[PDB]
Amino acid sequence: RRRENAERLQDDADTDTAGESARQRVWRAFENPHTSTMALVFYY
Amino acid sequence: WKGIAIALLVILVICSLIVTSVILLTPAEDNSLSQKKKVTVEDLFSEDFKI
Experimental method: cryo-EM
Chain-centroid distance, C-alpha A13: 12
Q: Answer yes or no: do A44 and B3 touch at CB < 8 A.
A: no
Does B8 lie at the interface with A, CB-CB under 8 angstroms? yes
Q: Answer yes or no: do A41 and B3 touch at CB < 8 A.
A: no
Nearest-angstrom CA–CA distance, A24 and A17: 14
Give the gap in angstroms from C-alpha A36 to the nearest C-alpha of chain B: 9
Chain-centroid distance, C-alpha B45: 38
Residues in chain B closer than 8 A to A43 (CB atoms): none
Question: Cα angle vertex A41, ends A35, A42, to 5°?
Answer: 95
A2: Cα within 13 Å, side-chain hemisphere = 0
